[PDB]
């Protein structure tokens, strides 16, 4: 979608409040859930492992451990469902994608913090 008309159509929908985050960081995502006629916000906390920067087609992957079971979710950055993104920790890694974390246990899966 690199043609100017497509770029205009996509630019019409871009968000304007996204915070800055990078793969190594730990983030909290607020997800809107509508049950019946009631709408609420649910938190999803985990470590980012992959980030695709493609304008309106941008996304990021978050991995967490829920009661001993690993869960990964790919969030579409500009989707209305994603209400808020909060960066709680900033890590120090050497590669863009951290798929190797899938095979590492709790203690071995530690990510060092980036210091100013």
């Amino acid at each position: 979608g690199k043609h100017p008309l497509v770029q205009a159509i996509e630019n019409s929908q871009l968000k304007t409040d996204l915070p800055e985050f990078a793969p190594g960081d730990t983030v909290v995502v607020q997800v809107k859930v509508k049950e019946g006629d009631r709408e609420r916000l649910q938190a999803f906390e985990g470590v980012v492992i992959a980030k695709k920067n493609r304008g309106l087609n941008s996304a990021f992957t978050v991995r967490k451990i829920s009661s001993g079971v690993g869960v990964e979710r790919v969030f579409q950055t500009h989707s209305p469902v994603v209400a808020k993104i909060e960066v709680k920790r900033r890590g120090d890694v050497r590669r863009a994608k951290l798929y190797y974390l899938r095979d590492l246990s709790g203690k071995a899966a530690r990510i060092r913090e980036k210091l100013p």
């Binding site: 008309l5 159509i9 309106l56 087609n57 500009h78 989707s79 209305p80």
Partner: protein, 211 residues
């Protein structure tokens, strides 16, 4: 019915307020200029001929130059006909223009185009034939057709038998597509789903025949 000729620009997505992601295709439309009306008296059938786009003079033959001059319109890259009825023939005269306003948001339409060319292709891709075993003694017969007929009776191969050949690059129509947006200022139609052909191909949009 009265339709529109346009160009396929590409695919993208639309986010609804509820958060749903709708895949869409964008069609650039240069308003179509009417060049001729065919009627029962002179041609034997009722139709409207339109042209769109532009063409440099050196690429326009003298006969087409005279045709467009009689029409009173500038030459276009292509010329196409729409079969119509008396009711929709009203208000349409040579030299007029048809634009994106012909359609409305929520309408169901059909889209016609030219599919991508795959060249020479075999049964596996052309006809979804099942392959034979890769191991257990198979010599050279992994993707071959196999048996093609019966024995001395009838002693031939019937017409219509499926075999390897050219695939794609043909006219294809897709029905039941929903108009998602009609941008008059940009002269663009946004339609849910996929439409045939490659980016930059010519496409035709008509009201859905099935109601």
């Amino acid at each position: 019915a009265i339709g529109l000729v346009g160009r396929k620009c590409g695919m993208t997505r639309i986010f609804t307020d509820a958060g749903v992601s709708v895949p869409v295709t964008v069609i650039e439309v240069d308003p179509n200029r009417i060049t001729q009306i065919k009627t029962l008296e002179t041609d034997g059938y009722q139709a409207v001929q339109v042209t769109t786009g532009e063409r440099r003079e050196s690429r326009v033959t003298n006969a087409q130059k005279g045709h467009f001059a009689k029409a009173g319109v500038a030459a276009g890259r292509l010329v196409k006909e729409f079969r119509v009825t008396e009711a929709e023939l009203e208000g349409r005269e040579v030299g007029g223009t048809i634009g994106v306003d012909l359609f409305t948001v929520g309408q169901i339409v059909d889209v016609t185009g030219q599919s991508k060319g795959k060249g020479f292709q075999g049964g596996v891709k052309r006809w979804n034939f099942r392959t034979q075993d890769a191991t257990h003694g198979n010599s050279v017969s992994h993707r071959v057709l196999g048996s093609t007929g019966q024995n001395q009776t009838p002693g031939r191969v019937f017409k219509g038998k499926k075999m390897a050949g050219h695939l794609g690059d043909e006219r294809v129509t897709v029905q039941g597509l929903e108009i998602v947006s009609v941008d008059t200022e940009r002269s663009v139609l946004v339609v849910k789903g996929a439409i045939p052909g490659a980016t930059g191909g010519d496409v035709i949009v008509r009201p859905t025949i099935k109601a």
